Design an enzyme around this catalytic site. Sequence first.
Site, PDB file in Angstrom:
ATOM      1  N   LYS B 197     -16.574   8.575 -12.708  1.00  0.00           N
ATOM      2  CA  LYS B 197     -17.572   9.189 -13.635  1.00  0.00           C
ATOM      3  C   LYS B 197     -18.690   9.930 -12.760  1.00  0.00           C
ATOM      4  O   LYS B 197     -18.968   9.701 -11.722  1.00  0.00           O
ATOM      5  CB  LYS B 197     -18.263   8.086 -14.442  1.00  0.00           C
ATOM      6  CG  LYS B 197     -19.179   8.499 -15.782  1.00  0.00           C
ATOM      7  CD  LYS B 197     -19.724   7.307 -16.614  1.00  0.00           C
ATOM      8  CE  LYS B 197     -20.517   8.016 -17.444  1.00  0.00           C
ATOM      9  NZ  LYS B 197     -21.128   6.827 -18.359  1.00  0.00           N
ATOM     10  N   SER B 273     -20.795   7.007 -23.126  1.00  0.00           N
ATOM     11  CA  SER B 273     -20.661   8.227 -22.547  1.00  0.00           C
ATOM     12  C   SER B 273     -19.438   8.315 -21.567  1.00  0.00           C
ATOM     13  O   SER B 273     -19.608   9.391 -20.980  1.00  0.00           O
ATOM     14  CB  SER B 273     -22.197   8.319 -21.812  1.00  0.00           C
ATOM     15  OG  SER B 273     -22.133   7.291 -20.527  1.00  0.00           O
ATOM     16  N   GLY B 294     -24.903   1.574 -20.019  1.00  0.00           N
ATOM     17  CA  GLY B 294     -26.177   1.217 -20.422  1.00  0.00           C
ATOM     18  C   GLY B 294     -26.448   1.034 -21.695  1.00  0.00           C
ATOM     19  O   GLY B 294     -27.675   0.512 -22.160  1.00  0.00           O
ATOM     20  N   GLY B 295     -25.443   1.447 -22.560  1.00  0.00           N
ATOM     21  CA  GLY B 295     -25.653   1.362 -24.170  1.00  0.00           C
ATOM     22  C   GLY B 295     -24.295   1.274 -24.620  1.00  0.00           C
ATOM     23  O   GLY B 295     -23.929   1.586 -25.589  1.00  0.00           O
ATOM     24  N   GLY B 296     -23.596   0.760 -23.782  1.00  0.00           N
ATOM     25  CA  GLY B 296     -22.056   0.363 -24.135  1.00  0.00           C
ATOM     26  C   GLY B 296     -21.211   1.644 -23.494  1.00  0.00           C
ATOM     27  O   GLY B 296     -20.351   1.712 -24.115  1.00  0.00           O
ATOM     28  N   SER B 297     -21.480   2.342 -22.775  1.00  0.00           N
ATOM     29  CA  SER B 297     -21.021   3.542 -22.456  1.00  0.00           C
ATOM     30  C   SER B 297     -19.614   3.301 -21.720  1.00  0.00           C
ATOM     31  O   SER B 297     -18.955   4.151 -21.371  1.00  0.00           O
ATOM     32  CB  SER B 297     -21.912   4.315 -21.530  1.00  0.00           C
ATOM     33  OG  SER B 297     -23.238   4.791 -22.115  1.00  0.00           O
TER      34      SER B 297
END
Lengths: 594, 597
Positions: B197, B273, B294-297
């Site tokens: 990534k 993301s 970080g938020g389910g990325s």
Amino acid sequence: YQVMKRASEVDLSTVKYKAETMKAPHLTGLSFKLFVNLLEAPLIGSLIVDYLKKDNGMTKIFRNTVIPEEPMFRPEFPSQEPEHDVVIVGEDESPIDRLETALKCLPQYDPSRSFRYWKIRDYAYAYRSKLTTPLQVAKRIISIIEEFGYDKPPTPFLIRFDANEVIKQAEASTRRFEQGNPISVLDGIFVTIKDDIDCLPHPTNGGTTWLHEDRSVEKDSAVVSKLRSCGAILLGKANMHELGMGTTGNNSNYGTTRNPHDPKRYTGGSSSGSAAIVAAGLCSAALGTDGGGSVRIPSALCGITGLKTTYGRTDMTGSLCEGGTVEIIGPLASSLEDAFLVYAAILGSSSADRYNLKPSPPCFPKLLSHNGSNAIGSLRLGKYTKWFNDVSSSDISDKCEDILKLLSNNHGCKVVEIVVPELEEMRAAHVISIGSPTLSSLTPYCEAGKNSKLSYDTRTSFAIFRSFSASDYIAAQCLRRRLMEYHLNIFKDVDVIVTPTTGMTAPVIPPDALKNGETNIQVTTDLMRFVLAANLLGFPAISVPVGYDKEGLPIGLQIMGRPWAEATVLGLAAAVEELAPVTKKPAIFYDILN
Amino acid sequence: MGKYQVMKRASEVDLSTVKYKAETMKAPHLTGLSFKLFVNLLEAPLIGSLIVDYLKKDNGMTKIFRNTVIPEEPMFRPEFPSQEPEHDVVIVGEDESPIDRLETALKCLPQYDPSRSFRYWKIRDYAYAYRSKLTTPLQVAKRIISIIEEFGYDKPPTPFLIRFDANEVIKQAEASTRRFEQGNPISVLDGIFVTIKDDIDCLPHPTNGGTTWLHEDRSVEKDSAVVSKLRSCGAILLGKANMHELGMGTTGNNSNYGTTRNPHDPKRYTGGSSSGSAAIVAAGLCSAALGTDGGGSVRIPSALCGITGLKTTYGRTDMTGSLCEGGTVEIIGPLASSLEDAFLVYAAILGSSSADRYNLKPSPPCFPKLLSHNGSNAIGSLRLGKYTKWFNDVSSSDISDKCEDILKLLSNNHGCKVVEIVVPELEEMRAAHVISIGSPTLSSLTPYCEAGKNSKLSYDTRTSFAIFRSFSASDYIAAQCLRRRLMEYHLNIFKDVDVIVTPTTGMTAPVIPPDALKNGETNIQVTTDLMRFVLAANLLGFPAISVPVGYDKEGLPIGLQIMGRPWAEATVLGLAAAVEELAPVTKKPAIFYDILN
């Protein structure tokens, strides 16, 4: 366009001392109130604050600078080498048991002392020799408070006082002495509690008029509960600079506590009443919070001993600053021995801090100093000369330099030149680190209409704190890590860092400032020049009196030590107290015990 | 307390009176010119703050951050008590090399059976082909390079990669080929292709985080910790994957490089993301990919694309050399097309930074015994926590149906007990998470944005940054007090259960609105459904994995999330291996490439 840094690669020989003072106009009275109304105005208020932060460099630091370090949200201490020539105390001992061990660390009591302040052991011997009783001492203290209005405006020591409660405790202590079973050396000792610490049966206002309306007090704070278990007598709630947001002691709500050495001068803040009542001799000790030097500053200006302990060493449960990242609760006393005994009683981490911070077990210094004093002489004293000398009057740097020479002469201490980089970044990181949780814990009450009830001094600070963004907070925690690394490296070469406690002695109170406070940054700048590292980074530090300036105003010396090294800073302070005893009787002093 | 100001507490909350609250998020969907104008209003000197303050007042964040007394002290980073050691796992040393951990990982797997040489290929399939000289890493590389150049997967408008150097890839594949011909491969990962990534540093490529410009201000002179560990094992780094810009989105929309498309339906989002990372794996081009979560990325795109995504415990895997180092909610984790592959990549990349080792004090890494039966006496002992009202709050009942079927299959085939639990204050968790992820992201980018480069960001990112700029420092403290509350709730839950099971997402892969391709979009009710179940793992640091469990009525993959105790990756992986046994990935994606043929 943007600037960049890095801490572990900084050339220490290139670090320059940044001497520029934060500059702003001094405002009192009506001009001050109009300025606060401008700060709180919907549109122009933010404009002003943004100009103030751009002018003092805070915007460059928080928003125009690339910082490579990761944030350090609370002081993170590596394992420390064990202290030398100390007594290791159990981690889960009772305050009563710690006081028994603390007595073994003191020189033998000589009944020849019963100018010099009275000590806790002088009271304890008088109670046990039936020379006096705690009830009689209480009556004498109660008489002096009522006679001079020390619990009333316009110049109170206490802003909460219940004479019946004091009599009640003193009678129970007297009964235990009559029955021949005192709880400890603190049984019958009178202790004053700062108004941001919970102490039954009193409410906690933090120097405000209204906080009791929204936050009640159901139980003793941890520090008071430990003192009460020793038989100490809680005298009342001490006056303070409102909510700890000041370093002078100015209080528009209750009146400004006056310096016992000169009642026209400030006591220092924010533990104003706590320091004054001890300096006047009314009670043996007091407890205060220190978030921005709030214990050490008034101790220095009032000529007494104030100990700022390591972050998390002493449980703060039951206080207005619990959960903060820069604050501690520490003792103020008129001698090193008394401050050491109160420390023995109140120390002890909360359960959460014990696991998170991992303190080494508390240690006591051997003050009887025989075998001695090889331990004191082996200590290395770090001096940042350009910082050390940045004071308003040469009397302060002279008096503190004389103490270093006396320590070298009598013990063999080596003074090592050090450099402390990024003091400017430290002040910026500290203000947002202390201000954000303070504002956060009061925001529901202030949003509910209670913001106008605060003083204009507090409201000036809160207008500034409200402009701090969450991303600003992150950046400031990255600066905390930088400063921790610098100081931990210094603590590889020296054992303590020595400075004057304050950059000026007790300043005169501007008469126009008594009405509704003032803003006088140049005065607050000199008062906080040396104290901020102990708060932002969590180190212990003590202020010990070391003499007087040309006008007879007390001068303080600060000894800041390694994490969890209270025993080291206490022992070195006791050696300083040997070479520079407090000799001047304050203009306001009361000889209890007679 | 429903009046002048609100008050709370946590250790005294009666869990039996906690009511599940519905989605209290309301907003309109904007694309194209409407979107641009809205961002210009948000960035306007006076009206922008008024709009943001209204949005925060309307979604309840102002009440939470500023009108509510919170008695807990702050928890600035996940603070884990000592955990009970895991059952039936193999302890691996804390300071072993990635090569040594891979050898230990192979001993935890069932014996390799070449009887299988639809189903994705596995890392051990590649490793057997290289070692039996059926094929070579150079052949596989040229086949992969051919597919990328033919379909334009390294160029707009629908790229998998946003940085690709075919010569670098060939270079690496030749060196791996040499070691196989010479008969000394480095490990089971020698010759295996992994995508990185674009918020993780990987030489020789720059790191832009999905932006067009970040390389101008932040250079990359070293491999990240995770890439250095992969490279030491002989893995071939394929290139930088496309992503939602700077991790500030859950769909994968990228107006700078083009939006990566879901291989199961190229008209639908991949999830974000880690968009590129997930797509390239689901398409079978490479064995695995690294992403940030970080938020389910990591979990979201993994679920939407029908692959396995492992979100590890906070601090378990060193994040040095990435855009989100120093954050308090993020991890770097693997995405793979099978549990086995994800487990092998985890073995290679794991290991804490020295600072995290001291501050977080992780227990030594453990590997599950996937041998296994039984084995499955340990699986059957796991107690599965289910919050039913939360579990079922999905947009399509196919999702709750398919995830419930897995729970029943686990009960009937292994004996697992499902325990009803309650997770209070889900609304507070979303508020606390948003400011906890946004503040360091905005802080680390502020000097470049103040320098004039804020207008170079996408309108999506600029919408988030306008909101983050309204978060105060006192708001940030209040959110950390919320973190402590939710940590206490979940630690208490982990006294009664071993894992918490939910759908990974509240919806399957959504269709990309065509007008959203030019300059992004704001679509909160889509991001709301996508983030419904993944926050706790980030705000509180727990490990969690997304495992494929089937498909909905339109053939779109459905994911199940297993969230475990701190440092319990082995428990989470073991249970996910049992779920994979009971629900194999059977459907070939519309976009799939059969490398090794």
